[PDB]
Coordinates of all heavy atoms in Angstrom, one line a residue:
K1 N 9.0 3.2 4.9 CA 9.8 4.2 5.6 C 9.0 5.4 6.1 O 9.3 6.1 7.0 CB 10.9 4.7 4.7 CG 12.1 5.3 5.4 CD 12.9 6.2 4.5 CE 14.1 6.7 5.2 NZ 13.7 7.4 6.5
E2 N 7.8 5.7 5.4 CA 7.0 6.8 5.9 C 6.3 6.4 7.2 O 6.1 7.2 8.1 CB 5.9 7.1 4.8 CG 5.4 8.5 4.9 CD 4.4 8.7 6.0 OE1 3.6 7.8 6.1 OE2 4.3 9.8 6.6
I3 N 5.9 5.1 7.3 CA 5.3 4.6 8.6 C 6.4 4.7 9.7 O 6.1 5.1 10.8 CB 4.8 3.1 8.4 CG1 3.5 3.1 7.6 CG2 4.6 2.5 9.7 CD1 3.2 1.8 6.9
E4 N 7.6 4.3 9.4 CA 8.7 4.3 10.4 C 9.0 5.7 10.8 O 9.3 5.9 12.0 CB 9.9 3.6 9.8 CG 10.8 3.0 10.9 CD 12.0 3.8 11.3 OE1 12.3 4.7 10.5 OE2 12.6 3.5 12.3
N5 N 9.0 6.7 9.9 CA 9.3 8.0 10.3 C 8.1 8.6 11.1 O 8.4 9.3 12.1 CB 9.6 8.9 9.0 CG 11.0 9.1 8.8 OD1 11.8 9.1 9.8 ND2 11.4 9.2 7.6
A6 N 6.9 8.4 10.7 CA 5.8 9.0 11.4 C 5.4 8.2 12.6 O 4.5 8.6 13.4 CB 4.6 9.1 10.5
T7 N 6.1 7.1 12.9 CA 5.7 6.2 14.0 C 6.9 5.9 14.9 O 6.7 5.2 15.9 CB 5.1 4.9 13.4 OG1 4.3 5.2 12.3 CG2 4.0 4.4 14.4
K8 N 8.1 6.3 14.6 CA 9.2 6.2 15.5 C 9.1 7.0 16.8 O 9.8 6.8 17.7 CB 10.5 6.5 14.8 CG 10.5 8.0 14.3 CD 11.8 8.4 13.7 CE 12.2 7.4 12.6 NZ 13.6 7.8 12.1
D9 N 8.2 8.0 16.8 CA 7.9 8.8 18.0 C 7.4 8.0 19.1 O 7.8 8.2 20.3 CB 7.0 9.9 17.6 CG 6.3 10.6 18.8 OD1 6.9 11.5 19.4 OD2 5.2 10.2 19.2
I10 N 6.6 7.0 18.9 CA 5.9 6.3 19.9 C 6.6 5.0 20.3 O 6.5 4.6 21.5 CB 4.4 6.0 19.5 CG1 3.8 7.2 18.8 CG2 3.6 5.7 20.7 CD1 2.5 6.9 18.2
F11 N 7.3 4.4 19.4 CA 7.9 3.1 19.7 C 9.0 2.9 18.6 O 8.9 3.5 17.5 CB 6.8 2.0 19.6 CG 7.0 0.9 20.5 CD1 6.9 1.0 21.9 CD2 7.3 -0.4 20.0 CE1 7.1 0.0 22.7 CE2 7.5 -1.4 20.8 CZ 7.4 -1.3 22.2
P12 N 10.0 2.1 18.9 CA 11.1 2.0 17.9 C 10.9 1.2 16.6 O 11.5 1.5 15.6 CB 12.2 1.3 18.8 CG 11.8 1.7 20.2 CD 10.4 1.6 20.2
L13 N 10.0 0.2 16.6 CA 9.4 -0.4 15.4 C 10.3 -0.9 14.3 O 10.5 -0.2 13.3 CB 8.5 0.7 14.8 CG 7.0 0.4 15.2 CD1 6.2 1.4 14.5 CD2 6.6 -1.0 14.9
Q14 N 10.9 -2.1 14.5 CA 11.6 -2.9 13.5 C 10.7 -3.1 12.3 O 9.5 -3.0 12.3 CB 12.0 -4.2 14.1 CG 13.4 -4.7 13.7 CD 13.7 -6.0 14.4 OE1 13.0 -6.6 15.2 NE2 15.0 -6.5 14.2
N15 N 11.4 -3.6 11.2 CA 11.0 -3.5 9.8 C 9.5 -3.6 9.5 O 8.8 -4.5 9.9 CB 11.8 -4.6 9.0 CG 11.4 -6.0 9.5 OD1 11.2 -6.2 10.7 ND2 11.4 -6.9 8.6
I16 N 9.1 -2.6 8.8 CA 7.6 -2.5 8.5 C 7.4 -2.9 7.0 O 8.3 -2.6 6.2 CB 7.2 -1.0 8.6 CG1 7.8 -0.4 9.9 CG2 5.7 -0.9 8.7 CD1 7.2 -0.9 11.1
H17 N 6.3 -3.6 6.8 CA 6.0 -4.0 5.5 C 4.5 -4.0 5.3 O 3.7 -3.8 6.2 CB 6.5 -5.5 5.2 CG 8.0 -5.5 5.1 ND1 8.8 -5.8 6.1 CD2 8.8 -5.3 4.0 CE1 10.1 -5.8 5.7 NE2 10.1 -5.5 4.4
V18 N 4.1 -4.1 4.0 CA 2.7 -4.0 3.7 C 2.1 -5.4 3.3 O 0.9 -5.7 3.6 CB 2.5 -3.0 2.5 CG1 2.4 -1.6 3.1 CG2 3.6 -3.1 1.5
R19 N 2.8 -6.2 2.5 CA 2.7 -7.7 2.4 C 1.4 -8.2 1.8 O 1.3 -9.3 1.4 CB 2.8 -8.3 3.8 CG 1.5 -8.7 4.5 CD 1.7 -9.5 5.7 NE 0.5 -9.5 6.6 CZ -0.5 -10.4 6.4 NH1 -0.5 -11.3 5.5 NH2 -1.5 -10.3 7.3
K20 N 0.4 -7.3 1.5 CA -0.8 -7.7 0.9 C -1.6 -6.6 0.4 O -1.9 -5.6 1.2 CB -1.7 -8.6 1.9 CG -2.9 -9.1 1.2 CD -2.5 -10.1 0.1 CE -1.9 -11.4 0.8 NZ -2.9 -12.1 1.6
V21 N -2.0 -6.6 -0.9 CA -3.0 -5.7 -1.4 C -4.0 -6.5 -2.2 O -3.7 -7.2 -3.1 CB -2.4 -4.6 -2.3 CG1 -3.4 -3.9 -3.1 CG2 -1.6 -3.6 -1.5
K22 N -5.3 -6.5 -1.7 CA -6.3 -7.3 -2.3 C -7.4 -6.4 -2.9 O -8.0 -5.6 -2.2 CB -7.0 -8.2 -1.3 CG -6.3 -9.6 -1.2 CD -6.6 -10.3 0.1 CE -8.1 -10.7 0.2 NZ -8.4 -11.5 1.4
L23 N -7.5 -6.5 -4.2 CA -8.6 -5.8 -4.9 C -9.9 -6.4 -4.7 O -10.0 -7.7 -4.8 CB -8.3 -5.6 -6.4 CG -7.5 -4.4 -6.8 CD1 -6.0 -4.6 -6.5 CD2 -7.6 -4.3 -8.3
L24 N -10.9 -5.7 -4.4 CA -12.2 -6.2 -4.1 C -13.3 -5.8 -5.1 O -14.4 -6.5 -5.1 CB -12.7 -5.9 -2.7 CG -12.3 -7.0 -1.6 CD1 -10.9 -7.2 -1.4 CD2 -13.0 -6.7 -0.3
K25 N -13.2 -4.7 -5.8 CA -14.1 -4.3 -6.8 C -13.4 -3.4 -7.8 O -12.6 -2.5 -7.5 CB -15.3 -3.5 -6.2 CG -15.9 -2.4 -7.0 CD -16.9 -1.6 -6.2 CE -17.4 -0.4 -7.0 NZ -18.4 0.4 -6.2
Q26 N -13.6 -3.7 -9.1 CA -13.0 -3.0 -10.2 C -14.0 -2.1 -10.9 O -15.2 -2.5 -11.0 CB -12.4 -4.0 -11.2 CG -11.4 -4.9 -10.5 CD -11.0 -6.0 -11.5 OE1 -11.3 -6.0 -12.7 NE2 -10.3 -7.0 -10.9
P27 N -13.6 -0.9 -11.3 CA -14.6 0.1 -11.8 C -15.3 -0.3 -13.1 O -16.6 -0.4 -13.1 CB -13.8 1.3 -12.1 CG -12.4 0.9 -12.1 CD -12.3 -0.3 -11.2
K28 N -14.6 -0.5 -14.2 CA -15.0 -0.7 -15.5 C -13.8 -1.2 -16.3 O -12.8 -1.5 -15.7 CB -15.7 0.5 -16.1 CG -16.9 0.2 -17.0 CD -17.6 1.5 -17.5 CE -18.7 1.2 -18.4 NZ -19.5 2.4 -18.7
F29 N -14.0 -1.3 -17.6 CA -12.8 -1.7 -18.4 C -11.9 -0.5 -18.7 O -10.8 -0.4 -18.2 CB -13.1 -2.4 -19.7 CG -12.1 -3.3 -20.1 CD1 -12.2 -4.7 -19.9 CD2 -11.0 -2.9 -20.8 CE1 -11.2 -5.6 -20.3 CE2 -10.0 -3.8 -21.2 CZ -10.1 -5.1 -21.0
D30 N -12.5 0.5 -19.4 CA -11.7 1.7 -20.0 C -10.5 1.3 -20.7 O -9.4 1.4 -20.3 CB -11.4 2.7 -18.8 CG -12.7 3.3 -18.3 OD1 -13.6 3.5 -19.1 OD2 -12.7 3.7 -17.1
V31 N -10.8 0.7 -21.9 CA -9.8 0.2 -22.9 C -8.8 1.3 -23.2 O -7.5 1.0 -23.2 CB -10.5 -0.3 -24.2 CG1 -9.5 -0.9 -25.1 CG2 -11.6 -1.2 -23.9
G32 N -9.2 2.5 -23.3 CA -8.3 3.6 -23.6 C -7.4 3.9 -22.4 O -6.2 4.2 -22.6
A33 N -7.9 3.8 -21.2 CA -7.0 4.0 -20.0 C -6.0 2.9 -19.9 O -4.8 3.1 -19.5 CB -7.9 4.1 -18.8
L34 N -6.4 1.6 -20.2 CA -5.5 0.5 -20.1 C -4.4 0.6 -21.2 O -3.3 0.3 -21.0 CB -6.2 -0.8 -20.2 CG -5.4 -2.0 -19.6 CD1 -5.2 -1.7 -18.2 CD2 -6.2 -3.2 -19.8
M35 N -4.8 1.1 -22.4 CA -3.8 1.4 -23.4 C -2.9 2.5 -23.1 O -1.7 2.6 -23.5 CB -4.4 1.6 -24.8 CG -5.1 0.4 -25.4 SD -4.2 -1.2 -24.9 CE -5.2 -2.3 -25.9
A36 N -3.4 3.5 -22.3 CA -2.6 4.6 -21.9 C -1.6 4.2 -20.8 O -0.6 4.9 -20.7 CB -3.5 5.7 -21.3
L37 N -1.9 3.2 -20.0 CA -0.9 2.7 -19.1 C 0.3 2.0 -19.7 O 1.3 1.9 -19.0 CB -1.6 1.8 -18.1 CG -1.9 2.4 -16.7 CD1 -0.6 2.8 -16.1 CD2 -2.9 3.6 -16.8

C-alpha cells in the first residue's frame, strides 16, 4: 500500500506484491539475540 500510494501519481497500478525475499549472507549467530527474539 505504500508503493501504491507513492506511485499512484504516475500510473494507476493494480495490485502490488513483493513475492520474494532471498537472504544471501547472514551476520553471525548471536545466540542471545535469537533468544531475545
Side-chain angles (χ1 to χ4, degrees):
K1 204 199 180 306
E2 208 279 324
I3 284 156
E4 207 260 346
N5 261 329
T7 325
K8 59 174 55 182
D9 161 86
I10 318 173
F11 211 70
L13 262 184
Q14 220 176 1
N15 59 326
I16 319 289
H17 289 92
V18 280
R19 101 169 163 87
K20 186 64 68 68
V21 165
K22 269 160 68 175
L23 269 74
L24 266 66
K25 146 185 171 183
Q26 305 171 8
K28 217 175 176 169
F29 209 99
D30 291 332
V31 185
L34 203 60
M35 292 325 187
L37 259 295

